[PDB]
Structure 1
Amino acid sequence: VVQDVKYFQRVKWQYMVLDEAQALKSSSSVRWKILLQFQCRNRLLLTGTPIQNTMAELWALLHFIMPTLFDSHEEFNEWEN
């Protein structure tokens, strides 16, 4: 996917299904930086145990699923509380 980006952009895919999606947890990655930006109508994450790390890695999976309301890490630190 990181090597063939423009060739996978060459089709209007309905679903980018994404297996074992804990692979996206690093927002620093070229993987996640590309994977936010593919044009498709819908997406799936199929995690064998999601998240389970520091807040930025929750944010990284969340923002891939939905871009809405995830505007900053500090608002996400507000959002038992």
Structure 2
Amino acid sequence: NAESSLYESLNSFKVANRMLITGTPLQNNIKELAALVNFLMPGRFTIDQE
């Protein structure tokens, strides 16, 4: 969730390199993957269409 408080807590960190460990990248909709790749690549990926 992009609006969850952990997203703004972690996205404001001054970090050069990030990495996400999970087992289920897609759960409900493409917006979850869009939020994950925006946390990874800020502004490079522009997934908007459902």
Distance across 1 between alignment mates of 2:23 and 2:12: 24
1:50 Cα deviation from its structure 2 partner: 1.1
Q: Which runs of 5+ in 1 are unaligned?
A: 1-25
1:62 aligned residue: 37
Counterpart selection for 2:5 from 30, 48, 51: 30
Bigger proportion of residues as strand: 1
1:44 Cα deviation from its structure 2 partner: 0.6
Answering whether residue 18 of structure 2 is matched by residue 76 of structure 1, we say: no
Distance across 2 between alignment mates of 1:51 and 1:77: 15
Counterpart selection for 2:22 from 47, 54, 72: 47
Question: Normalization by structure 1: what TM-score?
Answer: 0.51
Q: How much is the aligned-residue C-alpha RMSD, in angstroms?
A: 2.0
Structure with larger Rg: 1
Percent of counterpart pairs with the same letter? 42
Q: Which runs of 5+ in 2 are unaligned?
A: none
